[PDB]
Amino acid sequence: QNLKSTDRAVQQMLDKAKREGIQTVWDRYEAMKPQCGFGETGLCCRHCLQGPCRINPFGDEPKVGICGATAEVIVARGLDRSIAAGAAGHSGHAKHLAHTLKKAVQGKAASYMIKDRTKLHSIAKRLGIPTEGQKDEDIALEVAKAALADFHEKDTPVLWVTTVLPPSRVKVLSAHGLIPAGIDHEIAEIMHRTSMGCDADAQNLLLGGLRCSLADLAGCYMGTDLADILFGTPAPVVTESNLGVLKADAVNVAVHGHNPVLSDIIVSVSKEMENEARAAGATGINVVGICCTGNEVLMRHGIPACTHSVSQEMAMITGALDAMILDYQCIQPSVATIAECTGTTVITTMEMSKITGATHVNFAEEAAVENAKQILRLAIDTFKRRKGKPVEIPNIKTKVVAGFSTEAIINALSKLNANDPLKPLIDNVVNGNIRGVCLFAGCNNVKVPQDQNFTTIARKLLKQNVLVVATGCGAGALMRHGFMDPANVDELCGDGLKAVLTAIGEANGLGGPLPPVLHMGSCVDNSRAVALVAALANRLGVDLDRLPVVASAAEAMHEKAVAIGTWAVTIGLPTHIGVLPPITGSLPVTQILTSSVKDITGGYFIVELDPETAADKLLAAINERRAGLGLPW
């Protein structure tokens, strides 16, 4: 089972699933092998009913699609649609939060409110919205209107791009025509240009993809901005992760998906139902996280994270998961059938994401508290039904220090230099105590033993004094393996990094270092890493493609991960991806994405499936940036 997952709790549940005959994601993967090589390389097209068209990577015919589409075109069109799909997900999440904010301040949903007034005013100021003499509710209405306006064409470009990157970066992108005109506008233009008989030039297609990836970035940044207004900006928090956070004697409720608009409410209501939970024989309601909705409630409230990504079904295999409350994205639909064998109540809540066989509760912000109580009552009913049933919760968990929003990081550094908080970080980059910054992002993927690339790469970088930040299921992988426990700093960190983590920690009262890796939140909260890197760029007077900052989607899966990787490249970062995207069928497309894009945006993809080699390549990319700044490395 260590060939399926490096997580010992997951391995234990894989053994239980095997003896109980419950099929898992790894079993379904095995049943899919050998997978189609045309699809894996990108050399398949189904964009019209003359297809499917395939092209042999090598050899004889077919060499070209029926309409004449070349391998270059086919691969670039497929990739562009994946970017658009990812942008559609992140920006659908942001759009939902925009409507939620508008409702809150129009007095239509009093379960929601402006919790972070400081963040509201700073976002308003960034967008050019006047705050002097205005009611907070009016400023917020303007912010939510601006958010909605970035989805369509208007007299300005997408402000959640142009106001969040350095002017010099905006200028470079504008010169190449890459600034998005509107988020849903770009998604639709991708779907148009990639349909049959339209764009058929790889460079032109890929430029469109880069622009659509910035629409994804805008959705991510908008989502983080709106969620912080509504739910609070994260600050350091201490919690736990892995399946041992489930408690046999409690009602275990997982929040799973991406958008916390309902699961933030679940967290609140669950505490006010502690006595109703007790009347049913439980100690309490134990809300736990899965995937990014879990990250959201971890970062804001310290809710423990049960599991992530590819291993999500394992939480149900314990027998102790009374409810799984779903919104959208990255939810394996197998959960609805597994639930019949495990006793879990799987509940969908969003109209555009239902799963056959799950119970649907139509969540409305207007009714959030009532809907939450209905859902938790189902979970309580379920707890009662498992009276007397043995459960097998692996007694395995890690300590997690998290909550490192960009504001939190700036505040932590400000204890070393109150009026120039970024300077202590920069000083330690210059002197080499911090070699550079690496962001780990993205999913797990069944093709890769779970977490093996995140942990292997992170260990090498941390020994070389790289400041490692993480989001999403990359943060999930690292937290489940102890990378967010400060007790592991001596083992994992080089001496320079340890010194910096210790100096900042001790200056923040902790009598101990910051954790080895800083958890910056959910996938949309990759936008927080952008905010940090852009602030560093501003403070140094250079663009992001001169900073010693890299990204790694070390185990990517979702179309959203492709979008994030592409915008990381577009904003100027060397960007590692540790699974193969469907590009190898076209050398010209591969060469653009891994090399000639450098001449457009300064960033580039590093495709490398061997994680030791990827770490070396990421270090070389960091060290090249250091050399370009005239720094030792």
Residues in the annotated binding site for [Ni-4Fe-5S] cluster = 258, 292, 330, 443, 473, 523
3-state class (DSSP) for residue 347: strand
Which stretch in 62-70, 136-144, 146-154, 560-568 sits in contact with ligand SF4 by CB under 6 A? 62-70
Residue 102 or 301: the one with the smaller Cβ distance to its own copies is 102
Residue 522 binds which one of ligand SF4, its own copies, Fe ion, none, with CB within 5 to 8 A depending on kind?
Answer: none
**Which residue has the CB atom at the shortest distance from ligand FES?**
39
With the C-alpha atoms ordered 574, 580, 582, 584, is the resulting torsion angle positive or negative? positive
- Residues numbered 406 to 465 that lie near ligand SF4 (CB under 6 A) are none
DSSP 251-270: EEEEEEES-HHHHHHHHHHH
3-state class (DSSP) for residue 310: helix
Q: What are phi and psi of 22, to 5 degrees?
A: -95, 120
**From candidates 523, 549, 550, 593, binder to Fe ion by CB under 5 A:** 523
What's the CA gap between 576 and 587, in Å, rounded?
18
Which stretch in 59-67, 122-130, 336-344, 499-507 sits in contact with ligand SF4 by CB under 6 A? 59-67
**From candidates 10, 17, 53, 76, binder to ligand SF4 by CB under 6 A:** 53
Q: Does 36 bind ligand SF4 (CB under 6 A)?
A: no
What's the CA gap between 598 and 537, in Å, rounded?
18
Number of residues engaging ligand SF4 in binding (CB under 6 A):
12
333 preceded by a cis bond (ω within 30 of 0) = no
Residue 443 CB, nearest approach to ligand FES (Å) = 20
What's the CA gap between 349 and 331, in Å, rounded?
13
- Any idea what the Cα angle at residue 611 is, between residues 605 and 616, rounded to 5°? 70
Residue 291 CB, nearest approach to ligand SF4 (Å) = 15
- Residues numbered 196 to 215 that lie near ligand SF4 (CB under 6 A) are 196
34 preceded by a cis bond (ω within 30 of 0) = yes
Residue 203 CB, nearest approach to ligand SF4 (Å) = 19
Residue 124 or 190: the one with the smaller Cβ distance to its own copies is 190
**From candidates 22, 43, 45, 147, binder to ligand SF4 by CB under 6 A:** 45
From its phi and psi, is residue 143 left (phi > 0), alpha (psi between -120 and 50) or beta? alpha
Question: Which residue in this structure is represented by tokens 């932590």?
Answer: 412
Provide the annotated binding site: 36, 44-45, 48, 53, 67, 258, 292, 330, 443, 473, 523
Contact pattern for Fe ion over residues 432 through 471, marking x by CB under 5 A: -----------x----------------------------
Residue 442 CB, nearest approach to its own copies (Å) = 10
Task: Give the H or E element holding residue 96.
Answer: helix 71-105
Residue 419 CB, nearest approach to its own copies (Å) = 43
Task: Give the H or E element holding residue 78.
Answer: helix 71-105
Residue 394 binds which one of ligand FES, ligand SF4, Fe ion, none, with CB within 5 to 8 A depending on kind?
Answer: none
Q: Check if the beta carbon of residue 630 is closer than 8 Å to that of residue 623.
A: no
Residue 88 CB, nearest approach to ligand FES (Å) = 22
Residue 613 binds which one of its own copies, Fe ion, ligand FES, none, with CB within 5 to 8 A depending on kind?
Answer: none
Residue 70 or 134: the one with the smaller Cβ distance to ligand FES is 70
Contact pattern for ligand SF4 over residues 68 through 87, marking x by CB under 6 A: -x------------------
Residue 54 binds which one of Fe ion, ligand SF4, its own copies, none, with CB within 5 to 8 A depending on kind?
Answer: its own copies
Residue 31 or 418: the one with the smaller Cβ distance to its own copies is 31
Residue 70 CB, nearest approach to its own copies (Å) = 7
Residue 335 CB, nearest approach to Fe ion (Å) = 14
Q: Angle, nearest 10°, between helix axes 71-105 and 260-272?
A: 40
What's the CA gap between 144 and 121, in Å, rounded?
12
Residue 483 CB, nearest approach to ligand FES (Å) = 36
Residue 44 binds which one of ligand SF4, Fe ion, ligand FES, none, with CB within 5 to 8 A depending on kind?
Answer: ligand FES
Starting at the earlier edge strand, list the strands of the sheet with 251-257. 359-360, 345-348, 321-326, 251-257, 285-290, 305-307, 237-241, 398-402
Q: Check if the beta carbon of residue 480 is closer than 8 Å to that of residue 398.
A: yes
Q: Does 63 bind ligand SF4 (CB under 6 A)?
A: no
Residues binding ligand FES (CB under 6 A): 36, 38-39, 44, 46, 52, 54
Residue 57 CB, nearest approach to ligand FES (Å) = 12
Strand-pairing partners, residue 253, are 287, 323
Number of residues engaging Fe ion in binding (CB under 5 A):
8
Contact pattern for ligand SF4 over residues 149 through 188, marking x by CB under 6 A: ----------------------------------------
Residue 331 CB, nearest approach to Fe ion (Å) = 9
**From candidates 12, 24, 47, 179, binder to ligand SF4 by CB under 6 A:** 47
Provide the annotated binding site for [4Fe-4S] cluster: 36, 44-45, 48, 53, 67
- Residues numbered 288 to 317 that lie near Fe ion (CB under 5 A) are 291, 309
Q: Six-digit token pair at 33?
A: 């092998």
What's the CA gap between 601 and 58, in Å, rounded?
32
Residue 544 identity: L
Residue 49 or 418: the one with the smaller Cβ distance to ligand SF4 is 49
Which stretch in 43-51, 91-99, 141-149, 173-181 sits in contact with ligand SF4 by CB under 6 A? 43-51
Residue 354 binds which one of Fe ion, its own copies, ligand FES, none, with CB within 5 to 8 A depending on kind?
Answer: its own copies
Residue 53 or 533: the one with the smaller Cβ distance to ligand SF4 is 53
Which positions ≥6 away from 291 have C-beta within 8 Å? 256, 257, 258, 308, 309, 312, 329, 330, 331, 473, 476
Q: Is 27 exposed, middle or buried (0-12, 13-18, 19+ CB in 10 A)?
A: middle
Which positions ≥6 away from 555 have C-beta within 8 Å? 442, 443, 444, 445, 448, 450, 451, 452, 453, 454, 473, 474, 477, 578, 579
Per-residue H/E/C for 400-418: EEECCCHHHHHHHHHCCCC
Please state, in angstroms and as integers, the Cα–Cα distance from residue 276 to each residue in 248, 301, 367, following that order. Answer: 17, 22, 20
Residue 38 or 221: the one with the smaller Cβ distance to ligand FES is 38
Query: Cα-atom radius of gyration of the chain, to the nearest Å?
Result: 24
Q: What is the dihedral of CA 598, 460, 557, 78, to 10 degrees?
A: 20
**From candidates 66, 110, 188, 627, binder to ligand SF4 by CB under 6 A:** 66
Q: Which residues bind Fe ion (CB under 5 A)?
A: 291, 309, 330, 443, 472-473, 523, 558
Q: Which residues bind ligand SF4 (CB under 6 A)?
A: 45-48, 50-51, 53, 65-67, 69, 196
